[PDB]
């Protein structure tokens, strides 16, 4: 007699989902994705073709990522630990171009963020370790991958970090927002 | 060179998958599903409509489950702990009717099993806890759910468990193979 919750964020095309969880004498059960319910909430058809799975230590930051062609909508969640997850609008024609929203997603709260094509995405690990799962609307295309650097001074993203983040080299070498390839 | 691995089991429609895992000083990354790679391995198109997530304590056994109409193919894996996973051929006309295959799937080995429509499915938890994920080709339909009891004496499933399993009331009340609704 409860149900899945869907809430549009300050940038309305980004949606926060919360599944209905059933507990019992064995442990728990929930639907982590349902095509019908998801499409009703979004307002249009979306099909996914790839699922990705990462594990990251405390302080690791991955992002800010997007594919400029073969763009990927992303439905993301955390199945171990806790992350702060961020979406940045990179559509030049949008009234919220260059704005961002962020939410805490954890194994415990079971919250998910749907981040459509046209956005950049990243997360930082708050717990000892985190494992992060996501579904993508199109395939990996390394030639089309682009990166904006986490601490870009125009975006002004407030990551909850204690010391310097642990970054890959590609991410450490991300471009400035002012130099970045953006969507129409 | 390394890549995704796929191996047909003794009932050849059941496929054991193992992803290629990329490790670095942050942790790891892998594709847990890729529709191209999957369809190429099984030899036909597939569409998944629901993802499910459960948590279960040591000794818990769920199964043996199937839907007789709106039948669901299932791609299953473990993201925490270890289970013994079982697929049973319930297609009365099949040359392997009433046979079963089983494999150990764990968070660490990352193995997955593809169990097509027409099979019954079950697993037993061997670790402190296990979290089990699965994708389905059709939606949950409780009116069409059926169950065969875990210890049916004709199927003769060799569960690698020491003491008795913990079952739900539904699963304790599973039908005998001899009395069960089967597929043609
Ligand atoms: C995003 C992605 C990465 N990968 C591979 C490429 C890399 O070898 C590894 C990790 O990706 P990435 O974080 O880009 O690593 P690196 O900083 O070393 O380039 O996973 C896939 O196979 N599929 C994918 O969809
Ligand atoms: C399999 C499944 C179960 N459920 C619900 C039905 C139940 O209320 C709960 C647990 O499933 P189940 O184990 O079938 O019920 P029970 O615990 O009574 O044996 O999850 C879904 O919402 N979607 C699904 O796909």
UniProtKB/Swiss-Prot annotation, chains A, B:
Record site feature (Participates in a stacking interaction with the thymidine ring of dTDP-4-oxo-6-deoxyglucose), residues: 140
Protein name: dTDP-4-dehydrorhamnose 3,5-epimerase
This protein's GO CC annotations: cytosol
Subunit structure: Homodimer.
GO-annotated biological processes: dTDP-rhamnose biosynthetic process; lipopolysaccharide biosynthetic process; lipopolysaccharide core region biosynthetic process; polysaccharide biosynthetic process
Stated role: Catalyzes the epimerization of the C3' and C5'positions of dTDP-6-deoxy-D-xylo-4-hexulose, forming dTDP-6-deoxy-L-lyxo-4-hexulose.
Signal peptide start and end residues: none
Family note: Belongs to the dTDP-4-dehydrorhamnose 3,5-epimerase family.
The protein's annotated pathway: Carbohydrate biosynthesis; dTDP-L-rhamnose biosynthesis; Bacterial outer membrane biogenesis; lipopolysaccharide biosynthesis
Key words of the record: Carbohydrate metabolism, Isomerase, Lipopolysaccharide biosynthesis
Gene3D superfamilies: Jelly Rolls
Residue stretches in coiled coil: none
Matching InterPro entries: RmlC-like, RmlC-like_jellyroll, RmlC_Cupin_sf
Reaction equation(s) it catalyzes: dTDP-4-dehydro-6-deoxy-alpha-D-glucose = dTDP-4-dehydro-beta-L-rhamnose
Keyword Isomerase among UniProt keywords: yes
Family annotation (Pfam families): dTDP_sugar_isom (PF00908)
Enzyme class of the recorded protein, top EC level: isomerase
């Amino acid at each position: 007699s409860m149900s899945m919750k869907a809430t549009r964020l300050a940038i309305p095309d980004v949606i926060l989902f919360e599944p209905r969880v059933f507990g019992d004498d064995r442990g728990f059960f929930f639907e982590s994705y349902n095509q019908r319910a998801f499409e009703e909430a979004c307002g249009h058809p979306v099909s996914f073709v790839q699922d990705n799975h990462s594990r990251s230590a405390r302080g690791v930051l991955r992002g800010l990522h997007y594919q400029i062609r073969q763009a990927q909508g992303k439905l993301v969640r955390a199945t171990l630990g806790e992350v702060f997850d961020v979406a940045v609008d990179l559509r030049r024609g949008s009234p919220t171009f260059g704005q961002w929203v962020g939410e805490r997603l954890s194994a415990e709260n079971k919250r998910q963020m749907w981040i459509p094509a046209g956005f950049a995405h990243g997360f930082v690990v708050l717990s000892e370790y985190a494992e992060f799962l996501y579904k993508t609307t199109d395939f990996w295309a390394p030639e089309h991958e682009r990166c904006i650097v986490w601490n870009d001074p125009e975006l002004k993203i407030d990551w909850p970090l204690q010391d310097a983040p642990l970054l890959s080299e590609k991410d450490r070498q991300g471009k400035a927002f002012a130099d970045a390839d953006c969507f129409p």
